[PDB]
């Protein structure tokens, strides 16, 4: 009676209490103090209220399961519809509205039609923080902001991940490739699954480009989910000396203006020899030139370095595969890899000429 | 023998997790036949369903649920061998995997890719089935490649999985002695509960229709996002019965349920004993 | 150590020392594990920081004794056991990529 009254939701709650016989106010409703005084002058109404480990865990969970059964043994449309509903092995029809045309048009019964129920978390989007790994049999290394198709829960979706490292647990700063044989972190805009769920990732899902190699590229688990990530990409500012004394030097071009040097005063720099230093004051007439002080006398063949950190953003890109809405259901094509784009529009790969290593030979070091 | 007793009694202990699979009417166990294109599969699904239900099921399609025990019934479906997408989906929802291996050619990257996708998404039971044992006159090389396939399979599944050997096809399908004791291997498998499956309500769809309105299609003209009924058995946790439950149909997108009418069991198991040929059903 | 057995199976609680700023420090490669036989929580090593990302949580670990052959330098004496398997797969084989960890 009372449950039907509670969940019959076209009648007022005081009408439920009336035909059975507000929460900003925290403390509940009491009588008048005089009525309560004459009511509780007596005391006798409430005087009777006053006065192995593995098998143990399995026993606790089977105790909960028998509690589940013996409390399910109740009203038939209560159990079998609304208090739990359709346990397992129930044969159901399930109707979806606004299913696309292409499914019904191109429905080929070879390809299975699987459906899975999303949790409250898995309908949310945002940055998923994983730790992943180039799969040991995938040949080529992976690159940040190259798409790969993830299989994260029920969904398969192509995303743009960016591989990070917490370099001795200080930053979470941005790599440019995945490592060769171990795990890195990663962050991709996608549907937020729960933490500790595993996933695969694939470069190429089609069959025209299926090649001869191994097709699954990345493996990993999900570490954390968030709405925002704060990851950084190191930028150094390089400048050269042009007037050197003992223990101090005038540094030429890492800044364009004395306002910029004023913005950066007191910062610690270093040469490539590891000589630590500090910038002290902007010089007046040559504009980006400043005066720095070092540990000792630096040379004219050095480069000073201001290690700073620039924030980088994940790219909010997400397309699910929708392979069953195609006329071929293989041959799904998404965003291409960067080498594929360069091969398509014939751009040469970017080569900084002074980034290439050489064979340095030391001259012998003699002093006066 | 006391140290033996301690060190053997230790490896009974495992992580105590919940089960969430019912004991009264469990769903039909999803058996997925996975192979590279050109070996077994069809012939194998046909032979198993012919041995199981006494019914020549020529020209298969879709999931096929049969009753193969007094309480164990199971669903047969076949992945399209070129699609990594369907490979991934049935890796995520299958319970038993019949892993087809062309024993003459050897191992192959499609079955290796399925093995890794399953290993990362919650490795189900896997029974390997090696066909094309028509190597040469050399029974010596038959035995050699037999042992090498067994060892390489044992490095991918637990050490002591079952690799099964099928001989040549005779009259359209496999030898029924071999399929008889293959079904004897399927009948005792003792499934252990997974994690994603046992916190998620999923369902493989064996029947599909659009209950749209054809004169509404005549009005608007075939561009219509049209409604669809999807019939099948559901596994895992109990899917709630209120409309509006969100659902990912794995390959077409995200939807929410509109109405659920549960139906009586089309392939039910009937209530020492043996299984009557009357009660060996097929849906 | 474990009683009458040589190994013991356990449940990974949480990777201790996950905020240690030194790679391959003994504080960092150091896992807390609940043994399943008697329920008690012990602490176990792992071979390195590189194989620290094969255990995550409730992983069904298997752990043996450690066996220090001499007073080490960056040691923390007072951790007795080492992780030798994870989810029924040897993590030295996992570390050299001979097997893949199943879930």
């Amino acid at each position: 009676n009372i449950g039907k009254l509670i969940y019959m939701d076209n009648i007022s709650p005081e009408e439920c209490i009336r035909r059975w016989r507000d929460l900003e106010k925290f403390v509940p409703y009491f009588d008048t103090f005089e009525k309560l005084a004459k009511k509780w002058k007596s005391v006798d109404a409430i005087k009777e209220r006053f006065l192995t480990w593995y098998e143990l865990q399995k026993a606790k969970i089977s105790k909960q399961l028998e509690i589940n059964n013996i409390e399910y043994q109740e009203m038939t449309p209560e159990q079998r519809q609304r208090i739990e509903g359709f346990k397992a092995g129930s044969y159901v029809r399930i109707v979806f509205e606004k299913v696309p045309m292409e499914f019904v048009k191109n429905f080929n019964p070879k390809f299975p039609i699987v459906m899975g129920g999303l949790l409250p978390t898995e309908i949310k989007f945002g940055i998923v923080k994983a730790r992943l790994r180039r799969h040991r049999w995938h040949k080529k290394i992976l690159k940040t902001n190259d798409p790969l198709v993830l299989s994260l829960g029920w969904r398969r979706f192509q995303t743009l991940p960016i591989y990070t490292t917490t370099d001795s647990r200080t930053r979470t700063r941005m790599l440019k490739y995945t490592p060769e044989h171990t795990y890195c972190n990663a962050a991709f805009y996608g549907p937020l699954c729960s933490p500790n769920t595993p996933f695969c990732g694939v470069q190429i899902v089609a069959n025209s480009d299926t090649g001869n190699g191994f097709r699954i590229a990345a493996t990993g688990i999900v570490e954390e989910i968030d709405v925002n990530i704060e990851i950084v990409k190191k930028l150094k500012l390089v400048g050269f000396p042009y007037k050197i004394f003992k223990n101090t030097a005038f540094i030429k071009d890492m800044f364009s203006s004395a306002m910029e040097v004023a913005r950066f005063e007191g910062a610690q720099i270093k040469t490539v020899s590891g000589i630590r230093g500090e910038i002290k004051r902007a010089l007046s007439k040559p504009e980006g030139h400043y005066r720095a002080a070092f540990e000792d006398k630096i040379l004219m063949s050095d480069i000073v370095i201001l290690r700073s950190w620039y924030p980088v953003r994940v790219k909010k890109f997400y397309n699910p595969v929708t392979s069953l809405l195609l006329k071929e259901k293989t041959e799904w094509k998404g965003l291409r890899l960067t080498g594929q784009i360069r091969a398509a529009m014939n751009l040469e790969t970017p080569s900084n000429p002074d980034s290439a290593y050489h064979k340095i030979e030391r001259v012998e070091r003699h002093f006066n | 023998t006391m140290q033996r007793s301690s060190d053997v009694n230790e490896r009974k202990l495992h992580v105590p997790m919940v089960d969430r699979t019912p004991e009264d009417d469990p769903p039909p166990f999803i058996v997925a036949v996975v192979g590279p294109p050109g070996t077994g599969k069809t012939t194998l699904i046909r032979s198993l369903v012919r041995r199981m239900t006494k019914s020549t099921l020529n020209d298969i399609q879709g999931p096929i649920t049969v009753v193969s025990g007094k309480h164990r019934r199971l669903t047969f479906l076949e992945c399209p061998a070129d699609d990594l997408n369907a490979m991934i989906d049935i890796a995520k929802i299958a319970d038993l995997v019949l892993l087809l291996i062309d024993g003459n050619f050897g191992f192959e990257m499609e079955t290796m890719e399925f093995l890794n996708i399953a290993q990362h998404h919650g490795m189900p039971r896997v029974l390997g089935v090696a066909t094309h044992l028509d190597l040469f006159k050399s029974q010596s090389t038959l035995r050699a490649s037999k042992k090498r396939l067994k060892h390489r399979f044992w490095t991918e599944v637990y050490q002591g999985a079952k690799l099964f050997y099928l001989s040549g096809v005779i009259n359209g399908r496999y030898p029924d002695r071999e399929i008889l004791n293959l079904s004897r291997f399927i009948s005792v498998m003792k499934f252990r509960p997974l994690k994603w499956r046992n916190e998620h309500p999923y369902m493989l769809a064996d029947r599909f229709t659009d209950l749209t309105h054809p004169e509404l299609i005549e009005t608007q003209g075939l561009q219509i996002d049209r409604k669809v009924a999807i019939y099948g058995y559901l596994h895992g946790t109990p899917l709630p019965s209120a409309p509006g439950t969100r659902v990912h149909i794995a390959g077409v997108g995200d939807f929410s349920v509109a109405q659920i009418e549960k139906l009586p069991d089309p392939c039910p198991t009937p209530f020492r004993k043996r299984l009557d040929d009357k009660d060996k059903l097929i849906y | 150590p474990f009683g009458g057995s040589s190994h013991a199976k356990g449940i990974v609680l949480e990777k201790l020392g996950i905020e240690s700023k030194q790679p391959n420090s003994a504080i960092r490669k150091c896992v807390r594990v609940q043994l399943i036989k008697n329920g008690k929580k012990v602490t176990a090593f792992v071979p390195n920081d590189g194989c620290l990302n094969f255990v995550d949580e409730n992983d069904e670990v298997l752990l043996a004794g450690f066996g220090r052959k001499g007073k080490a330098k960056g040691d923390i004496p007072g951790v007795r056991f080492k992780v030798v398997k994870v989810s029924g797969v040897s993590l030295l084989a996992l570390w050299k990529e001979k097997k893949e960890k199943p879930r």
Binding site: F214 | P37, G106, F107, M109, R152 | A93, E97, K98
Partner: peptide, 14 residues
Amino acid sequence: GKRAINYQILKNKG
């Protein structure tokens, strides 16, 4: 059309 396995997946000398 037979994507044959190769030596590092075959012999598994990781």
